């Protein structure tokens, strides 16, 4: 009689797949076959921030689009002023093993996590004039793969324990615990409204969790391997996922399908970072092939290459205003393109 | 034209840069190692004069006459996590520790070595094989035949020839012969010499890296 319950799981999976198939009246490529291609996106290395001594693993543009934080394996979280390249801050981390970093939208706080399994939140606005860890969120049983700020008080984090956690910084306890992922969670992205967040895991699946409910609204299974990076569309009704299978995939929440796929026969490496331009027409994917590819969101056609790195592009980010892109690689350099 | 505030910001930026570079030197004379092996292979007491300093990553520091080695022990079965591994790519050399008197589990150790020796990230780091429990192997070789846990088996089935056979079996899984080097040392647990071996291997690897950078070979 135990298999009678799994019969329900099979029936629900069949219903979901049938609904997805019946809802695909056309394809994005076919619909976008009568638009002007972007052409060639020839960006240039406007700035080259050279402060780190090890492999930079994460970065996050500030809300002002001028200040950016970057975490390195050398135990340093450096806050840079992109316009002038001056290091506005250089916080020494307790644990050198850092794999994520985040800049608060208000800019008053910064976050960093890693193999320590604890998210350290530092306050950049202190009357003492020095950046000190304001909070040490703990409870995750695995390494922190990503974390993003919703406000000065709440923070969403994803760990290697196959689960995510929404923490209230003041209390220091997990307000919400998102569970359901079968593999380690590698990246998360917050929606523009900061109400639903999309998380990718090693189980080749992406889940659109609800911040105010703690439930997986939808699950997307289109990738063939680990989902390393994820980013929402600027509209907020769609997102993109980069995977180790050398293929990016653009899904839509309302359709709950794989709207488009980006892949090339000459690209066999894994995607390390994914980001969207201000208008969402350009999807910048930082690969392990030492290069970044600017794919056309609506056409799946490569539009340019930001080849300036001697090692893999671990992290990629786009300014809020869309003025410039920032790519941080394992070569310990962070280059701002425009 | 740069404003006074901008000039002061540049001064602060250079002060932070000099902080980073001073700490860079201070760390630069410290070598990061990676320690692997089976649970009972002898990971805990490989050096025997250490001082342990979240999950896994049991860092342990020691020194030998000019260097501060920091071995980052990685939890069991974590040698192929694919997520912590790329973190330990700056490791100067790996310190894999095997167990000679572990025939039944020997294959597993070999497999683990094959995983780390041929790993994409750990393709150039020079393993340092530590065939531990040589004392127990001494009696076991003369008591338990190695052919029990080896197809080719040992011809003479003696302590020396069998030990060499096991060492070579560990070494044979080094397809990238000309890219990396593997050092072997048959410790006996109660030996105050493993630190010297690690220091010698690390110095050799550092000299080789410097020669490569200079382009000599």
């Amino acid at each position, epitope marked *: 009689e135990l298999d009678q319950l799994r019969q329900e799981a099979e029936q629900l999976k069949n219903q979901i797949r049938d609904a997805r198939k019946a809802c695909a009246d056309a394809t994005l490529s076919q619909i976008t076959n009568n638009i002007d291609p972007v052409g060639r996106i020839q960006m240039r290395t406007r700035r080259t921030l050279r402060g780190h001594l090890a492999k930079i693993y994460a970065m996050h543009w500030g809300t002002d689009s001028r200040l950016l934080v970057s975490a390195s394996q050398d135990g340093k979280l450096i806050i840079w002023d992109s316009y002038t390249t001056n290091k506005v801050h250089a916080i020494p981390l307790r644990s050198s093993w850092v794999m994520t970093c985040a800049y608060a939208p208000s800019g008053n706080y910064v976050a960093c996590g890693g193999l320590d399994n604890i998210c350290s939140i530092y306050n950049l606005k202190t009357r*003492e004039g020095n950046v000190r860890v304001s909070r040490e969120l703990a409870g995750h049983t695995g390494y922190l793969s990503c974390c993003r700020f919703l406000d000065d008080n709440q923070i969403v984090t994803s760990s290697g324990d196959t689960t995510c956690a929404l923490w209230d910084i003041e209390t220091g306890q997990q307000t919400t615990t998102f569970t359901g992922h079968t593999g380690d969670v590698m990246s998360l992205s917050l929606a523009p409204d900061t109400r639903l967040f999309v998380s990718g895991a090693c189980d080749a699946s992406a889940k659109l969790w609800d911040v105010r409910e703690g439930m997986c609204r939808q699950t997307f299974t289109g990738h063939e391997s680990d989902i390393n990076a994820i980013c929402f569309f600027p509209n907020g009704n769609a997102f993109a996922t980069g995977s180790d299978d050398a293929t990016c995939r653009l899904f839509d929440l309302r359709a709950d399908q794989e709207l488009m796929t980006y892949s090339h026969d000459n690209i066999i490496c894994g995607i390390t970072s994914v980001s969207f331009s201000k208008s969402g027409r350009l999807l910048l994917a930082g690969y392990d092939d030492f290069n970044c590819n600017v794919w056309d969101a609506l056409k799946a056609d490569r539009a340019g290459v930001l080849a300036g790195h001697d090692n893999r592009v671990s992290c990629l980010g786009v300014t809020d205003d869309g003025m410039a892109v920032a790519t941080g690689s394992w070569d310990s350099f962070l280059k701002i393109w425009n | 034209t740069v404003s006074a505030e901008d000039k002061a910001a540049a001064e602060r930026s250079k002060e932070l840069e000099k902080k980073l570079q001073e700490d860079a030197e201070r760390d630069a004379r410290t070598v990061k190692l990676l320690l692997l092996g089976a649970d009972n292979s002898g990971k805990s007491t490989i050096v025997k004069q250490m001082k342990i300093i979240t999950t896994g990553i049991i860092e342990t520091q020691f020194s030998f006459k000019d260097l501060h080695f920091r071995m980052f022990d990685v939890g069991g079965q974590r040698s192929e996590r694919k997520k912590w591994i790329h973190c330990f790519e700056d490791v100067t050399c790996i310190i894999f520790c095997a167990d000679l008197s572990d025939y039944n589990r020997m294959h597993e150790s070999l497999h683990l070595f094959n995983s780390i020796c041929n790993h994409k990230y750990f393709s150039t780091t020079s393993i340092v094989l530590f065939l531990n429990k040589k004392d127990i192997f001494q009696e076991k070789v003369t008591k338990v035949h190695l052919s029990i846990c080896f197809p080719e088996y040992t011809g003479p089935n003696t302590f020396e020839d069998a030990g060499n056979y096991i060492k070579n079996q560990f070494l044979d899984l080094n397809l990238k012969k000309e890219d990396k080097e593997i050092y072997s040392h048959m410790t006996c647990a109660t030996d105050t010499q493993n630190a010297k071996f690690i220091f010698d291997a690390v110095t050799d690897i550092i000299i080789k890296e410097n020669l490569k950078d200079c382009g000599l070979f």
Partner: single-chain antibody
Amino acid sequence: DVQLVESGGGLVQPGGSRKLSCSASGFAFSSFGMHWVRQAPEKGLEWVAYISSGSGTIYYADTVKGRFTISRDDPKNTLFLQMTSLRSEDTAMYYCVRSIYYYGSSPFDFWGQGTTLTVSSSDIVMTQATSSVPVTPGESVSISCRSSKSLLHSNGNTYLYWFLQRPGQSPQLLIYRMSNLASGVPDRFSGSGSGTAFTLTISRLEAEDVGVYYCMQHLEYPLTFGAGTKLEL
């Protein structure tokens, strides 16, 4: 708690030498530049000297160049001003002012209780011609300041600082860069203006708004303060 204590001030003959000390406690003094600003017995503030973080850069006022030497001992968290050949014009209260320079910073945010030093008997002019401003609680006021040279730099920052000195209290930063409200300042204060004309507006004057408001330019050294608009009941 941020604290700057001044000491070493007293009576010195016209020609002697003295060493004013400023002890800093409660913040990373090593990472903070320090200014020396002197207020005459009845005149306004005047920037005397400045030392940058790490002692890399040092600046002196035109009237004290060659006679005043500014130094710092970071391990001791101390700042020293050695004055030699002290003229009668040096009689004033000296304040050591904290200042950190980085994007989004608040230079001159905190001041220290000044020490009295009594002596026995190409600059951006800033005009503040509103010394007298009678007002009462519950009203709104608008102090005005002018600059000979525009303080709006090409980078988009207008380097104008509005400070307030209450009766018996050291100056406190109210507005920095003509638009940003300093930490701890009530929101009623609002700095505005453009080009060479700037204004500080107080909507509802409370009992803590009585005192002398000073306007200073940080575009380029030497730093010049305003005459000082006195709001009294």
